[PDB]
Design a protein around this ligand. Structure first.
Ligand SMILES: [Cl-]
Ligand SMILES: [Cl-]
Ligand SMILES: [Cl-]
Ligand SMILES: [Yb+3]
Ligand SMILES: [Yb+3]
Ligand SMILES: [Yb+3]
Length: 129
């Protein structure tokens, strides 16, 4: 599923990401934009041989199981394919764990490089919430 900007903001809010670990909704929407372009089906191979899955590009080395990533820990206890669903519950649940790991949203390098410190409120501008 390719979400609209405000549609995803609404879905993230409904699943409790708004201000989760202190990160406003716009931070999460901005992260999703640059990680997946709001596309739940996004997958991208990493240089270490792991793969990133879903709207928040969650990796198969630490977080989900894809069956092809040596060293897999599957800390979210989910198949990586569940992170591709039109329902974002699995991605959200796992992102809550990731952002709690100690470095906050810096765990998403695209967030650090492209969202951190910017006017992230712009991402939810005009949305009914
Ligand atoms: Cl957009
Ligand atoms: Cl915001
Ligand atoms: Cl933090
Ligand atoms: Yb990546
Ligand atoms: Yb860690
Ligand atoms: Yb409201």
């Amino acid at each position: 599923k390719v979400f609209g900007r405000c549609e995803l903001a609404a879905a993230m809010k409904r699943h409790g990401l708004d201000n989760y670990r202190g990160y406003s909704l716009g931070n999460w929407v901005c992260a999703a934009k640059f990680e997946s372009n709001f596309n739940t089906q996004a997958t991208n191979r990493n240089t270490d041989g792991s793969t990133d899955y879903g709207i928040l590009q969650i990796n198969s080395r630490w977080w989900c199981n894809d069956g092809r990533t040596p060293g897999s820990r599957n800390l979210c206890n989910i198949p990586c394919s569940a992170l591709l669903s039109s329902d974002i519950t699995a991605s959200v649940n796992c992102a809550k764990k990731i952002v709690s790991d100690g470095n906050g949203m810096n765990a998403w390098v695209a967030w650090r490089n492209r969202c951190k410190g910017t006017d992230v409120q712009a991402w939810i501008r005009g949305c009914r919430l």
